[PDB]
Amino acid sequence: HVYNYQPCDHPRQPCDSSCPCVIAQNFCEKFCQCSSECQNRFPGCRCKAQCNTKQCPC
DNA sequence: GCGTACGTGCGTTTAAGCGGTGCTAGAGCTGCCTACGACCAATGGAGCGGCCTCGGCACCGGGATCCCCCAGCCGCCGGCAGCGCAGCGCCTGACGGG
Numbered sequence: 145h146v147y148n149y150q151p152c153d154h155p156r157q158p159c160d161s162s163c164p165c166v167i168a169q170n171f172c173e174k175f176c177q178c179s180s181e182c183q184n185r186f187p188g189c190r191c192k193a194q195c196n197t198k199q200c201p202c
Numbered sequence: 203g204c205g206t207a208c209g210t211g212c213g214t215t216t217a218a219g220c221g222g223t224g225c226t227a228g229a230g231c232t233g234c235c236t237a238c239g240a241c242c243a244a245t246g247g248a249g250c251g252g253c254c255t256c257g258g259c260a261c262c263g264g265g266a267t268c269c270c271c272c273a274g275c276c277g278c279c280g281g282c283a284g285c286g287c288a289g290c291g292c293c294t295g296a297c298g299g300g
Binding site: 197199 | 272273274
């Protein structure tokens, strides 16, 4: 069930299980209204050599 | 489960052990003489107290390793399953015998 990303909006709600990204089984993008503390956002892709291999989580 | 090496036993054999000398070295003691450490009275300054000021170390923050981990990756190889086959014993021909 691959779902197209949708910007979840949480003006006062937390990034709860009601989060559209959460229910969509997908990470919250930086375009989402989930704050800079949302735990569903991607962490940052710090693969030193090249972000290109099996060790690269990305 | 393997296996060796250490316990048990036997058969030499030899140095411990006993009993015996014989010695003098060295310990024990005494006599006597000296010096050296305790004691006493003085003296000052080394040591101990009281301030009291810088920076060595503490602490931080950040960047720098660097081991630790492990899937990636391949080599290897052996097992394994499949395939081709080598050899044999029987099967069965070739041909004279029965």
